[PDB]
Design a protein around this ligand. Sequence first.
Ligand SMILES: Nc1nc2c(ncn2[C@@H]2O[C@H](COP(=O)(O)OP(=O)(O)OP(=O)(O)O)[C@@H](O)[C@H]2O)c(=O)[nH]1
Ligand SMILES: Nc1nc2c(ncn2[C@@H]2O[C@H](COP(=O)(O)OP(=O)(O)O)[C@@H](O)[C@H]2O)c(=O)[nH]1
Ligand SMILES: Cc1cc2nc(/C=C/c3cccnc3)sc2cc1C
Ligand SMILES: [Ca+2]
Ligand SMILES: [Mg+2]
Ligand SMILES: [Mg+2]
Lengths: 440, 421, 67
Amino acid sequence: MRECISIHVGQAGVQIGNACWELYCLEHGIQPDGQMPSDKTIGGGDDSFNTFFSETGAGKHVPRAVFVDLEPTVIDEVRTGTYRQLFHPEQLITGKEDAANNYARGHYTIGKEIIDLVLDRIRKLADQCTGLQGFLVFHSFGGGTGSGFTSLLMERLSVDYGKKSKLEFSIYPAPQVSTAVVEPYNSILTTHTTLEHSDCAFMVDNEAIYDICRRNLDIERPTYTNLNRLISQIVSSITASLRFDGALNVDLTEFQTNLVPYPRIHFPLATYAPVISAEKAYHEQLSVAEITNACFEPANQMVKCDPRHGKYMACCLLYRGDVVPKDVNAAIATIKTKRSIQFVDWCPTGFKVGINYQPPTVVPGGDLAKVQRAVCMLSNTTAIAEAWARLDHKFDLMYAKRAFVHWYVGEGMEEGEFSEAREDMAALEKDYEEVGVDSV
Amino acid sequence: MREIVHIQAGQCGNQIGAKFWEVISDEHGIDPTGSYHGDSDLQLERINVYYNEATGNKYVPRAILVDLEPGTMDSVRSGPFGQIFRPDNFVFGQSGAGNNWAKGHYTEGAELVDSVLDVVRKESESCDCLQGFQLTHSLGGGTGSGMGTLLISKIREEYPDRIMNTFSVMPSPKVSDTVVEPYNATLSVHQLVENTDETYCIDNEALYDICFRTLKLTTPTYGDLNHLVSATMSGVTTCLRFPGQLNADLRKLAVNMVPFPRLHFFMPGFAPLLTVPELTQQMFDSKNMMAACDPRHGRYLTVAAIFRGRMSMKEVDEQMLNVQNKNSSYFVEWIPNNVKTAVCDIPPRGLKMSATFIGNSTAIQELFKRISEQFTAMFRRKAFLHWYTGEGMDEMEFTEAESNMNDLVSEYQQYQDATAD
Amino acid sequence: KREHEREVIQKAIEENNNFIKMAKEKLAQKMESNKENREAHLAAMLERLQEKDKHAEEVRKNKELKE
Ligand SMILES: Nc1nc2c(ncn2[C@@H]2O[C@H](COP(=O)(O)OP(=O)(O)OP(=O)(O)O)[C@@H](O)[C@H]2O)c(=O)[nH]1
Ligand SMILES: Nc1nc2c(ncn2[C@@H]2O[C@H](COP(=O)(O)OP(=O)(O)O)[C@@H](O)[C@H]2O)c(=O)[nH]1
Ligand SMILES: Cc1cc2nc(/C=C/c3cccnc3)sc2cc1C
Ligand SMILES: [Ca+2]
Ligand SMILES: [Mg+2]
Ligand SMILES: [Mg+2]
């Protein structure tokens, strides 16, 4: 019951899926062959982890996930990797030719040739659910598949499943690890298209994650492996309420009620703590107070922006591990008298708190230290519009000269689609200004 | 899974094509007999890009050798790595081109183009997912220029949704074979602008200057010039042939490098001719360019840099940021993050580490201005036009080719003077 | 009050159905518009290449009328 189906699109989506599903298996004690010795109920069950894992007669715990990419090289590694026995072959879908960082190829030219197959595979998962809650879609903004095909998928999912909840984990493009120049185009295009088809989207700035890995983990040159393992921890924190049962546990949908005041305003800012190496975490225990303080340090945000220069519409604290309400309340009280937390005048200023007793786990051979407690803050701040602003500006610089647009027109797109997508972004930025203005 | 079909036409095209397969076979551990005797599995992971796997674990180059005379192609079969090529892929004529573009594109070359296309189809249908094509040729000759551009047009018909790239060799009076080369070049460019996605301008004048001034060679031969071409071609194909952080085919490469369809003529670079800052600074040095153009006389639309060898990834990022800041004026502002960097662990033969440069600069107009200047100097007096009008051409077609290349120059100047505001 | 309860839930169904209808139509419009545009793009490209054939035949014909 209340099953969640994950869909990982493109290179970024797939590889992030790898990290998350590896992390999930470690959290639930699931072996790479799919076996779970602790699970006494054979064949099925109504346990909390069953929302993400289905069960077979042989006791194999199978991820409710679909991996999609327009080229095979990335998903092939999953087919031959450590967790190859974890996924049924039908869950791993590949094409021959990618979208070449072209939104048009991902949404039209190449994407249309595989979209029916993908939906069919998704339908096979949905039919195994007794009460499907919704979808979790993992993709990049800058890739042709992660942008183009995702938007096509989100559109089709709205048709096949109505208003069944769809959540995004989106990878915001950053120069440090980006290898494409047209990513602002693909980003604006996919954001405009999925906007009315997405209930909630967690953006992850690659530069923010890049910085955290360098600053807090002493990594000179962070790889995708470095970034993804950190990203998986945030994703785990966000989905922990769905996968674990607890007394102090607060469902994600309940947080979502506070996080989304208007349909278009559905981009929460995520902040995670503690991110610390084993060398620095040795003989140094980080309390509830300390990790809660770190949430309001901008250097720990998933997205680079300044909440101090914006206004809050919601603040959620998702704790996990050795954490009791008493310490949380004390920590919050201290913060509320020191930090620059400014709320809009039309919403309460309280902090919504959740606690999962299950302590954080780390991937073996990783950089993150094994901490007793961790916290992920999800806040709705107008400051996240800065991420739109930086991206929209890069868009305008190239489009004024119509740079690279011929690659899109050649694949069947029109200039009207670009301007329409940009105007939507303009309205979106304008929407974030309007919600911050005080009432009459 | 991502295959490339290689085509070489004319004297120049085959000789630089031969050297290309020699260098990359050495890097992939392929002997002239076609067997593999390397030491790394990274030499075979993307081996299918340029090689076919036949009976007996042989790696046969997916290459098609074309010419209108047996002369040059016979030297390939007898030279090193001669028995490695597929014998049926040898398509040669007899009558020759006589250094005439008209005979290459309209008369002689058109009588042989179908037999070449048959070999292309056979190679293309054996591909799981064909990326596209790469052509090595000269623009100042007859076969490589005339029939080379002819092949492009015919392939564009049968494979319009494939990438068409060329390694074109620009004619120079310093290494001039004839005197009618400005005509052949201009006519070739007139075709390249319309029917190619990427074109590498291997300028002979630049090659001669490097050998003479930098490599200290008083009497440079074609063997000396092609040594620079081989090293350059080996570098620009590195990320395609080797496993790395970059997962991109010809199409994805073109998307990041070509902001405007016509403006797709790149300035190759190489270093050295040793620390990462030094390697980076030399890579952007105008004396290390394979095109006789000063990048500080124009602005960069897009830049692709490739580092090879074991080095500090952190230091590479630091130096690439450092050069952009200190030289911001030479990078257009209306294209954010137009400089990309790739790194391969495997260095070229003989070097600890190297760097290959691919620049899309507006300063390449200097190369076209040079050709146009030599072109119009002959066309204004109707010199040697009987060679072309005798094959069926007219003066109108010459004027159109001249007008198209002059437009290309105006276009490069437009975006050079373009500003963000 | 009972008939108001009916009107609310049937308004929810109507809005949900219209959203699905709009999405299906907008998508059908886009995939059709794209198909026409991409075909026309390749149609124009091949027609130019077929024009080069017409020009090439005239070249060989013009030379033939010189012998
Ligand atoms: N955080 C993170 N970002 C990634 C990862 N892989 C790719 N990206 C980002 O994704 C963007 C490029 O899109 P990709 O996902 O790699 O490409 P794709 O979705 O497969 O689309 P096509 O290759 O064009 O078919 C770049 O901005 C990368 O920084 C990853 O493993 N982790
Ligand atoms: N770098 C280099 N240039 C060459 C070579 N052979 C010919 N060229 C150049 O190509 C031009 C003549 O083209 P050519 O080879 O005769 O073309 P073809 O008529 O098709 O055989 C001259 O300007 C030469 O400078 C070579 O082996 N290396
Ligand atoms: C951005 C970027 C682009 C790029 N393009 C290359 C050329 C490939 C090629 C090889 C043979 C024929 N035609 C094209 S290498 C390269 C490296 C980077 C980082
Ligand atoms: Ca069970
Ligand atoms: Mg990809
Ligand atoms: Mg010759």
